[PDB]
Symmetry: C2
Amino acid sequence: SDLDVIRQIEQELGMQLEPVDKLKWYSKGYKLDKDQRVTAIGLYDCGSDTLDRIIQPLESLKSLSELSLSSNQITDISPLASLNSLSMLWLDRNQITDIAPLASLNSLSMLWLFGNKISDIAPLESLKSLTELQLSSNQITDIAPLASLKSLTELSLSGNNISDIAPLESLKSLTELSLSSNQITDIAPLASLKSLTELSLSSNQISDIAPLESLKSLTELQLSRNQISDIAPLESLKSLTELQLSSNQITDIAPLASLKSLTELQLSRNQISDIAPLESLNSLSKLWLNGNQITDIAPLASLNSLTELELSSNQITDIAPLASLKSLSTLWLSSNQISDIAPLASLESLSELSLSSNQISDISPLASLNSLTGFDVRRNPIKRLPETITGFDMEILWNDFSSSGFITFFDNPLESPPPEIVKQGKEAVRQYFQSIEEARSKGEALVHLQEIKVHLIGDGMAGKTSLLKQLILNVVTKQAPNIKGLENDDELKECLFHFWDFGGQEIMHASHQFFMTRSSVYMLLLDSRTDSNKHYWLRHIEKYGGKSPVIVVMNKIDENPSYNIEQKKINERFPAIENRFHRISCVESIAKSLKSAVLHPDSIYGTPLAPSWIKVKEKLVEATTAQRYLNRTEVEKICNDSGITDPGERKTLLGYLNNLGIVLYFEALDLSEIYVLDPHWVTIGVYRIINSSKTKNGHLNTSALGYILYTLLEQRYLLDIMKQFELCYDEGKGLFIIPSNLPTQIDNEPEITFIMKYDYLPSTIIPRLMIAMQHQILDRMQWRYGMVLKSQDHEGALAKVVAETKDSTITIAIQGEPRCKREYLSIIWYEIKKINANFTNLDVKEFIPLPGHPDELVEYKELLGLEKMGRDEYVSGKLEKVFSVSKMLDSVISKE
Amino acid sequence: SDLDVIRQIEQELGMQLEPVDKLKWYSKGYKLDKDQRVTAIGLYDCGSDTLDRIIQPLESLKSLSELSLSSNQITDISPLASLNSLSMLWLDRNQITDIAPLASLNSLSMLWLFGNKISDIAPLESLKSLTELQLSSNQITDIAPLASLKSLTELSLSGNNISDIAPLESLKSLTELSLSSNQITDIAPLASLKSLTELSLSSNQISDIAPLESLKSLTELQLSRNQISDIAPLESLKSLTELQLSSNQITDIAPLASLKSLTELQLSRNQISDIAPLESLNSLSKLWLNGNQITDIAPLASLNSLTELELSSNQITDIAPLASLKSLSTLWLSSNQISDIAPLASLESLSELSLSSNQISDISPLASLNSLTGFDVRRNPIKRLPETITGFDMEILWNDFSSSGFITFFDNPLESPPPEIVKQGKEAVRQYFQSIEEARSKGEALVHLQEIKVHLIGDGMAGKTSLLKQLIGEGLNVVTKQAPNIKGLENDDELKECLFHFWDFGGQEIMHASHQFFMTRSSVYMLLLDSRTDSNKHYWLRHIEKYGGKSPVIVVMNKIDENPSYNIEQKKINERFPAIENRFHRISCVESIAKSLKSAVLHPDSIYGTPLAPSWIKVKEKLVEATTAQRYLNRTEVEKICNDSGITDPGERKTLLGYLNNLGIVLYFEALDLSEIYVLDPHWVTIGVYRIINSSKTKNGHLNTSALGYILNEEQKFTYTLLEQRYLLDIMKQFELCYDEGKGLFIIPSNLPTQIDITEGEPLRFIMKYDYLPSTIIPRLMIAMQHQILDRMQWRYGMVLKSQDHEGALAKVVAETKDSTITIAIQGEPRCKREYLSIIWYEIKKINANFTNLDVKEFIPLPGHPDELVEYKELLGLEKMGRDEYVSGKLEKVFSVSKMLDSVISKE
């Protein structure tokens, strides 16, 4: 009964088909008429075993006109040849290689082949009734049967290997035509094709755009990612409303002054330096100008219809002309030389902003923009924030991106409030300004801190113990009068120094991101013997510490006075040293370098603190150093004895002391018996359990913490601390794995069918990654320098990432199905960059080896740079072989 | 033209002009006729001040017909237009760019423009009387104005930027044509020219050689450095006598069987695996087949006219077929799989041989070749040399090359005699065999040595003194303790007399320069690691490989009881450095290392395999006894010691002191010959030089002779007289640690600072990427080029150079320790810069040879970007592969490979 056929279909496939008014490519149902006859049916995403079956009920549908087989990975399309009455056929995003059964369908007017492996286009020649053909993203190289299938109006051949577009001269009935991401160099045949309204021609090799001067009906042109340097033929296309010619060599944009009907103009990665002709485009609303050399944006003041500007990566100094654009809603001014943002107070409709990488020191005028819903101000010399910054409808963050609805800070020399308070949200920034306001209202003069951590860095304690006696995990804290050099220096009689010695294992870098970056002074210890490993530790300081001041002291020079380093080139590479180089011989100049490092303006010394915050600080350090840890009632009795009654203050103050490393407080635990902990007590507890006999192989049994370490709950707290420190994880039944202590032997798995080269490979990059993918290991397949993964989501996907310490590279090798493997690398690579961001200035160059050779690598930026620009095949002189550029960038789909 | 005119010419220029019978390009004289009229004059190499003022006497020479201006760096040739009667003109190897004045010489039949910068050849169009044109080595791109002068017979266009040879189809009277080092891909216009007898087409992009099938008169073809894989069109050129198709893609050489008139065939760096067709070439005398895949050389037995074979870099196992080639005079069988060379004993005419990088263990059958004048046997598993090896007419050497008239050894596990005896020449190897022959005749049983040096390697003395405490107990400290004093071999009777020498060079390997065998032979390296010093793990592992080489190494990971999780990847580390032999240890609260020390002294490659005469050990123990008590020994003392053991022949004592000197047991400098200081104690010299290197007066690299007393005698045991100071400076000068500048001023390049105050103009950057950069590569270069430094512009990690040959040639070599690279930056003229680089780079590879297996990857940066470098092996590999474009995706620019390769070298 025709409709009972769909009941046969939803039983043969297992799915259920629901009616739809108009059949679409993604539809999972049928469409009947007035007399209940199926005229359209859709089977979106059902498997490749669909055309092999369900074809007999399809042939019974005599009135069937429209069929959709979108995205089924179909390889054989023979059974559909029996449907010579189809008017619309969707074969998009399948695995079709041979095309031929469609030749017997001389009644189709709509054909979609969005993502197949089509190398022959001949059988479409007999299809002289087509009006909309979609052949994008295939492997077509020679087109010719396209002049036969005339009378079509919409054609798409984007993402192929086409170099000759001559057969298109006959199809003078084209309304829409897209020819992007191909190998076109001659666009002469397009000089015909009248009544073309939408043309796309991005990512090609075109340079002569003269034939486009005749297309007077063009209203939407796309000429991006090409090699065009003369937009002169564009003076006549006065009907254009969307023009995009980004990533070219355009310098003169004079012709664009005649296209007064433009509404979306994109000319980015070009060489434009004079945007004067754009003054006439009063209807322009979307304008992109990133990556040019624009210095005067005065012509933009007449474009009162702009709603989305993009002036990033330029050289703009003055911003006054943008004040008259009261309708502007999206500004991107990153990477410029902007110093004053006061003219931005007149942008009442501005909602999203980005001012990263500039020279801004005051963001107070933006406090009037009550419609701002996400503005970015990273990498700017901002020292103090206005108190009105807590009145926005956004939460303040401390990250290295530009998220919508958040005030983001990063690489900012923040003093009021300091970065340790900014990362905790608005309520922390609000409680800091409220503390200094309540203190000064009481007539209390604000006090700084003068307390820093001295990180002793070097290979071997031979230079550490020789220097630690020259001045006077193991943390020794001695105040200023106990330092040989500034014994009676009244300028810092209250200064505190905390000497730490992490033997390469930076335990605090994972949890407390500010233990290594802020409130830290790094001290490199070098001599004639340990001069070989000189640049490794210098890079070890840069990635972990960053902008923290460094002191390079070369001791034991009286034994070999010829020992000296290249302080000029070393300081130019690491500006954090500030020429703090010393040579100890048998007068301590290092004491002057410690002074210049604690009193540094970028350090916490520049942060004004309330006097009550120092009162609870000195009391917590007094009680923690005497009672190991403190409980919740003890800490509240200390805060209440200093006027800190609001839980908002004490919650955001303990986080401040936690970020500095003075007193530890884990909010993710909330055990009132162990509220605040002594750093000297926990680090010793964690250092003994990691370097224990029972953990010599990386395996840790919970029923053994007593012998190593301390009550039973203190053991349960220390393992939660290690779990917080991203050093281990629980596998079940009291089985923990210390990923840093695992061996490197027994077995591997480099079976048959991508490297990230660090400048400095952190030794915690693999262990903290191994805990993030703990439920994906292939039954105890991890060891120290790698791991083996197996996804339950993607059936055919086996991964094995390994780190090479000799080359400081992490290679990832995955096998399985392309749609199931290329996705698995995108989830691992994202999780690796998620942890790479915790370091400072990491140089990651992604390489992919050549097919058939383990060595001889090619940069991912090179082959990706070879595509879109044109030319194929990456030639290797040392191998005398070509390997093709399109075959290797298979880890990405298409375009983006 | 008159003779008084040339007298004015040889006075205005300074040279002297002598008569010559026939004028040539290099002639520095004149040529008169019967009526004493100058009809030819030549001014070869006289200066750029020529023709601009000597043209007026040239115009007075009315009978002048031939003019030679060879090699004068001439830039303007305008005055030469007045000589419209010249028939031969030599303008070779100048700096000519415009040849417009040459159009008015419509009477020339000989024109040579050998090495100029000429991009336009249009004025030659009117020269319809030319029969010999030389336009090699220029910048010619369009050879279109060459079709008019169709009366030429000899044309040369090698070394240009030519890509279209279509205009050459008209000159159908060509007999000789050279068109090498261009960008040719289509040789179809060459399908004519039926009278071509000599054609050269090397270093191009040619792949279709079909048009060459018609040149039946061709007798000399050159088609090397191309992309040819089908030599079928060559089957008909039966008149060929010299064919060269090297560096191509040839696999089938069947057409060569038809060219039975071949006498010089070159097919190197191809893919040839079947050399059967060559059996018919009975006139073949010069044959090159290196770099192929040849496994059967049986067809070569029928080529009884071969005098120079070249079968290197193949896969040859059997060498028997070469026994019938009684006329062979030059054999090159390097880099193969040859194991037996006995069939080579029938090569009575063999004079030069090379068997390096093979599997040969016996060179005794070759002792019958009484005509051998230089045969190479490096990198072969040779354990013992035959005593007849001193009967050849050659001197024995120990180097990494094949010099004529010398027996060269290198990388050979020599036991009898050891390499320490081989380096002293043939007369030394003869004196070694003479001692063991006299010993066995006297009934004295031969004795081994059992003495090794333990090199303490590691960053920081924290682990060094901790390991020296594992035995009995403990800047340079030399402690020698025998086996029973070692915790582990207390009662080990297998080596109760074994001696151990513990050394600790604080990174500064003082002995590597002079005594090349102090680090390689009789040495055991011990790497000391702990949980903290694991970062600098691969630096020292490579530091051991480059300095020590094949010496056994023991990797000791100490302080593991503090962190039991500490252990290295012993599998991958041992596979990279096979000298480890899995000698990994983990010391916790030191006796298993003793078993590894035994396995390193008892090594077969060590000195245990060397049989010594019993008298050589008697004087050894006597010299060490006397040196350790009297510092140094004089000549009469050491000779009285040798005579007390029967060593009377000075040949033995000179080659025995040299043997002990190469091992580091007893120092003896033959290049000094101070009879008061003949033999020295190693402990005394090393302490003496270490005090001069780490002294206050040498903190800046400068050393004043009038201050040595403060250095060696008084600073915060031993005694150093004034003559001992003069000897230590000669020792340090021998150790390549310092050099003399004059007036008692020495420069220690290892103690120099790192100051400042780059290059601008026509730069030439060149980078050498080491896998391990030795800290003595720059100091030892500064001593080799001391008389070329630009005054007081020298520091530790670099130097500034200035060549005396090429005026203005300025160089600046710099070492980057952060990248372990040596950068060379020269400026000036290309012919004056690329020559200065060829002597600097050679002097660097001259010092690189002292190390073992160093990976030097030479890079050259792109011309428009200081960073972003490209490897020199890629650009050189693109030419052989056949392409002129290096594409850079991260830069989105294409770069011609010929513009940057010719900026470094051109003899390709």
